[PDB]
Design a protein around this ligand. Structure first.
Ligand SMILES: Cc1cc(Cn2c(=O)n(Cc3cnc(C)s3)c(=O)c3cc(S(=O)(=O)NC4(C)CC4)ccc32)n(C)n1
Ligand SMILES: [Cl-]
Length: 515
């Protein structure tokens, strides 16, 4: 009758309006929080913060650094060592009228990759997908705006951009405007030292950021991601007339890194599972129906996954409809097992249809989501990376159930004085990545019970699973089942599977029935 089972959405918000409960404290500058704009925000967009630039192992190597030098071959075949930022400016201010000339300009400061990079998805989009006039508008309007924005980087970033490395709790806050500039540079593949595919290299524990690998990819989902990105730049680049369309606010990136001190012993959790306000919806999406909640990103340990590539499932889609997330790739070291990344403030610019191979851009989206005191849209996303399984049976090992419990734990912790809003999630690391929906739902319930967060769970058209999970929360509620007690049952199922989906839930019935 209704799409959903369990408690209502009013309930998930603790009967207060969405957005009254916040997911992150306000931005303030500190030892553990670098802020790229001036506090407090008076004018908009925020005014950039000024401090000496850094070209070192602790900060982003910015394309405009005076330390960035580059060899050029010449007309006549000799070598000049020049400043790469000067070469980038010269290349991008030559006229560029075709897809081939764009590729040659980008390659002119990436000459190592001359015979490896071919921007086939860009050729497909401009030569075959758009008609002659939409393509003329690309070269006469859009691309000049992207270049002009990229070339303002020394004006918009006047402060070193720190890397968020392994095992450090740190935050970084930037303006949406600053992010549009960094992303324009990525679009034009300007970031130094971030292209090599060599196995052990300076940045190999970091994601890719230059957009070349997207351009090298194929198929319809890749073009639709390109359309999302184009659209973002139409939305946020100043037009020839004015700059009133430029976004006004802020985005914050928080590396959460758990200490041994924070590790839950799951057999000592007396938390009642049925006391979790659980809302299980078979329609709806996290980005729409989960407004006000901590929304989950079914992440790869490299933030963004294959968004610059062939990837086009849950993570990748979020990163092209809310492209400000992409800048996380620039400074976020890959996640270790007891770490997570919270991203607050990312505006949505695109609508979409489908999923995976059927993903399509389906139009403009005007985000009216309210901004917090710090100038951030109150869209809070946590990146947590599930394990992938070649073998489904492997996931029922005790150590790898604990791993996932602890991964979701560090993603979902609150660590603020005000009460935590609900989490909005779903079949995390399931489908083709090997995970069991039935188990991953319980692990997430355990974590929410333990932390005291409501849980809004989306099954995406699967009514059967909605019911099996609702019914199993009812058995917990009136048996007063407990985290440690469900852990005990789950460890039993571990040793059972060893000696050799729908059957996990059958055997809790059994171990529960005896109580
Ligand atoms: C209501 C709805 C949405 C969708 C499409 N979709 C999807 O198919 N999957 C995979 C699965 C399909 N059927 C299953 C039983 S799983 C999704 O995982 C999915 C996820 C989202 S989301 O996470 O809310 N948002 C994004 C993409 C921004 C992060 C949305 C649609 C999904 N379906 C079938 N039914
Ligand atoms: Cl030159």
């Amino acid at each position: 009758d209704d799409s959903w089972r369990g408690v209502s959405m009013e309930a998930i918000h603790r009967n207060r309006q969405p957005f009254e409960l916040e997911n992150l404290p306000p931005v303030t500058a500190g030892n553990l929080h670098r802020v790229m704009y001036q506090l407090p925000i008076r004018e908009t967009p925020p005014r950039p913060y000024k401090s000496p630039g850094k070209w070192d192992s602790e900060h982003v190597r910015l394309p405009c650094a005076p330390e960035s030098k580059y060899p050029r071959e010449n007309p006549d075949g000799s070598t000049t060592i020049d400043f790469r930022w000067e070469m980038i400016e010269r290349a991008l201010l030559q006229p560029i009228k075709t897809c081939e000339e764009l590729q040659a300009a980008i390659i002119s400061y990436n000459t190592t990759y001359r015979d490896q990079w071919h921007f086939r998805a860009l050729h497909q989009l401009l030569d075959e997908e758009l008609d002659e006039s939409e393509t003329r508008v690309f070269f006469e309007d859009l691309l000049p705006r992207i270049i002009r924005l990229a070339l303002r980087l020394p004006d918009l970033i006047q402060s070193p951009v720190p890397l968020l490395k392994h095992h450090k709790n740190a935050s970084l806050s930037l303006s949406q405007q600053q992010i549009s500039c960094l992303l324009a540079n990525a679009f034009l593949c300007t970031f130094p030292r971030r292209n090599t595919l060599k196995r052990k290299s300076e940045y190999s524990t970091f994601p890719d950021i230059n957009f070349n690998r997207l351009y090298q990819s194929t198929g319809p989902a890749v073009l639709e991601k390109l359309k999302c990105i184009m659209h973002y730049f139409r939305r946020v680049c100043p037009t020839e007339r004015d700059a009133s369309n430029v976004p006004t606010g802020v985005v914050t990136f928080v590396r959460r890194s758990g200490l041994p001190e924070h590790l839950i012993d799951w057999s000592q959790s007396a938390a009642p599972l049925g006391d979790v306000p659980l809302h299980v919806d078979a329609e709806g999406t996290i980005e729409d129906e989960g407004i006000g909640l901590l929304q989950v990103d079914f992440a790869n340990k490299y933030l963004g996954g294959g968004v610059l590539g062939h990837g086009c499932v849950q993570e990748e889609i979020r990163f092209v409809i809310c492209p400000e997330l992409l800048v996380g790739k620039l400074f976020t070291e890959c996640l270790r097992p007891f770490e997570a990344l919270v991203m607050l403030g990312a505006e949505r610019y695109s609508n979409y249809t489908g999923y995976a191979g059927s993903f399509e851009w389906s139009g403009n989206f005007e985000d009216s989501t309210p901004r917090d005191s710090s100038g951030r849209r109150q869209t809070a996303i946590v990146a947590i990376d599930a394990l992938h399984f070649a073998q489904s049976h492997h996931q029922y090992r005790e150590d790898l159930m604990e791993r996932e419990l602890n991964k979701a734990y560090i993603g979902f912790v609150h660590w603020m004085v005000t009460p935590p809003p609900g989490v909005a999630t779903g079949n995390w690391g399931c489908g083709a990545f090997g995970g069991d929906s039935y188990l991953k739902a319980l692990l997430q319930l355990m974590v929410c019970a333990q932390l005291g967060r409501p849980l809004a769970y989306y099954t995406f058209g699967n009514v059967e699973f909605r019911d099996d999970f609702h019914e199993m929360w009812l058995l917990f509620r009136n048996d007063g089942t407990t985290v440690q007690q469900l852990w005990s049952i789950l460890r039993s199922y571990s040793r059972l599977i060893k000696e050799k989906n729908k059957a996990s839930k059958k055997k809790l019935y059994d171990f529960i029935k005896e109580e």
